[PDB]
Structures are given as C-alpha cells and as structure tokens.
Amino acid sequence: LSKSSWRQEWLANLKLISVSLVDEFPSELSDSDRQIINEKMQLLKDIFANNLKSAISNNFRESDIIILKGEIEDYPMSSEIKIYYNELQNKKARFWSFMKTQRFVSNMGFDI
C-alpha cells in the first residue's frame, strides 16, 4: 500500500486513460514565458504517450486527465477549458496544473 505499489497501480491505470494536453494559456504571459511552458508541455506529452502508455487526446472533453499550461484559477472565465471546468462542477475528468503534472511524472520516475 506504499512506495512503488502506488507507481505500479498508476502505471496500470494510465494504460486505460485518455490524456488531453490543453492549447490555451493562463492570463498575462510574455512570448518567452509561453515558449518555456510549451517546451515543457511537449516533453510531458511524450512521457504520457511513450512511457505512461496513455492515449493522447486532441479533445479535452474526450479525456480522463487534462494537462493545463498553469493553474485553472489563472485561466480567464471566457476560455473554452475554464468554461468546461465550470460545467463539470455539476456532477469527471482530472484537471492538473502544469506544476502538478511535472510533480506527478517526477514521482513516476520521469524528471525534467
């Protein structure tokens, strides 16, 4: 019930998960800020596809895990993803922040 049991249980679940990585960004970001995030997003996409054996979704509505380019709170009300997150409040998919996803993969044995 502890250490790699958790890693092993996740590895199994991820083989049966659809993961979508978001296109939209949180408010007030510079071109560099966005680039740096995009590069990181790109490797997270690889770990999920290649290592965690998850299916990469091009539709965030058709996925069990949604990977954000920041915290959902920082996303504007008007963005497609925030709109979707808000409708899912009436019962769903797991909305992970950019930092949380980084933490997860690192615990899975895939550091950046």
Partner: peptide, 10 residues
C-alpha cells in the same frame, strides 16, 4: 479515486 501524490511517510 487514486491519489495524485505518492504516500508521504516522514
């Protein structure tokens, strides 16, 4: 139903 974080035991 599964935790996103590993079992922290320290």
């Amino acid at each position: 139903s599964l935790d996103s974080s590993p079992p922290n035991t320290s």
